[PDB]
Design a protein around this ligand. Structure first.
Ligand SMILES: O=P(O)(O)O[C@@H]1O[C@H](CO)[C@@H](O)[C@H](O)[C@H]1O
Length: 391
């Protein structure tokens, strides 16, 4: 796609998801349980981003810069006035790190800080995808809603395949804990107040391992290191990644769970973009997590989508960039949202990102903001979406 003539970009807001990180330490014991195999090592601890993650984000920031300059939002090689860019990430190493690389990459040698709560290592409610309603009746409505969501999915082939690549029957889950079937395993969904919706069972092991295999791919481990050369071969990946996208769908894609869990980001966006656009900076960078993008996208009732050359519905370094454009001809404003990310090969190979060889881009759409032939939506309808979403 290519923006039409007569349109001038006015404001940008990116919802980013941190780049290449090591598998979550939080899932450390479920990976040991799920197989008799040895797990490759990482030089970074728990779930911190890797040096490659930073390198990949630098490219992402350089591409974003070239695009922003090309669109008149900034100039190339000169750096913008004091408060042009505003970067905010939550207090996790992972998210703050990717913001530093992104910014240093987009505006090298400038003086654009990265904001975050003073308390680091802990979560910032803004980005914390937790249940903020202790209605009790709500935690029950949530669990059920999740369960129903899982029912729409079909991961039987994913599990069977997973069982084999993982040699799960020889794992200390089948031997010792009698859990010997991912496909028949019972799933129990949680939703305790002030915490992330969870899953205990085959769906967790599924998402945990596949996430580890997926990260291993990107980090560039040789093929015999990514799932021990097992997950290799064709698109067993397409079916294995369903456990990973199905996990996300059940915990954050539910309508009533999304609306709650996302409450703070919707509120944020609906303020920097609507109620307080006059005070907001031309450019904003929110670095969050896939949970945030999953619940955010749902809460604002987005139309389904599909990312080309990507197996994850929320790409490791992908960013949802909201764009307010002003149509010179007809004195009106317009919203154009797009998912800007790096394909899997772009991540695995670490390709220099430039306008010559751009990052992947898919234009999204809001149910309440029908998109036109060029992918634009009137700022009127969008406004109503966010102002309605916050209610
Ligand atoms: O987007 P990342 O941080 O890489 O991964 C996500 O992070 C979420 C917390 O923000 C957590 O709840 C999800 O399980 C995890 O997949």
């Amino acid at each position: 796609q290519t923006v039409p003539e007569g349109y001038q970009l006015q404001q940008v807001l990116m919802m980013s998801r941190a780049n290449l990180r090591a598998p979550l330490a939080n899932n450390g014991s479920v990976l040991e349980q799920s197989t008799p195999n040895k797990w490759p090592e990482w030089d970074v601890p728990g779930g911190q981003l890797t040096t490659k993650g930073g390198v990949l984000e630098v490219y992402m920031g350089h591409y974003m810069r070239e695009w922003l300059a090309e669109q008149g939002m900034v100039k190339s090689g000169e750096c913008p006035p004091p408060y042009t860019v505003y970067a905010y990430a939550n207090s996790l190493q992972r998210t703050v790190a990717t913001a530093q690389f992104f910014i240093t990459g987009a505006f090298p040698g400038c003086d654009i800080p990265v904001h975050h709560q003073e308390k680091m290592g802990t979560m910032d409610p803004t980005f914390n995808p937790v249940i903020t309603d202790d209605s009790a009746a709500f935690s029950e409505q949530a669990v059920a809603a999740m369960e129903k969501e899982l029912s729409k999915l079909q991961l039987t082939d994913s599990y069977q395949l997973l069982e084999k690549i993982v040699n799960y029957k020889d794992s200390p889950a089948c031997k010792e804990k009698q859990q010997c079937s991912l496909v028949d395993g019972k799933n129990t969904f949680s939703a305790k107040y002030q915490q992330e919706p969870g899953v205990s069972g085959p769906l967790k092991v599924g998402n945990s391992l596949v996430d580890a295999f997926t990260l291993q791919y990107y980090e560039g481990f040789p093929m015999d290191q990514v799932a021990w050369g097992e997950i290799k071969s064709d698109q067993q990946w397409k079916v294995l990644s369903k456990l990973k996208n199905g996990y996300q769908d059940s915990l954050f894609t539910s309508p009533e769970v999304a609306r709650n869990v996302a409450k703070p980001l919707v509120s944020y966006i609906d303020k920097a973009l609507v109620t307080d656009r006059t005070s907001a900076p031309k450019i904003t960078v929110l670095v969050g997590h896939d949970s945030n993008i999953a619940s955010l996208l749902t809460a604002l009732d987005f139309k389904p989508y599909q990312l080309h050359d990507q197996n994850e519905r929320t790409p490791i370094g992908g960013k949802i960039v909201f764009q307010r454009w002003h149509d010179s001809k007809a004195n009106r404003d317009l919203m154009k949202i797009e998912y800007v990310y790096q394909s899997a090969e772009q991540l695995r190979n670490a390709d220099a990102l430039t306008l010559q060889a751009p990052a992947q881009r898919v234009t999204l759409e809001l149910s309440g903001c029908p998109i036109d032939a060029d992918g634009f939506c009137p700022m009127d309808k969008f406004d109503s979406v966010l102002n309605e979403a916050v209610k």
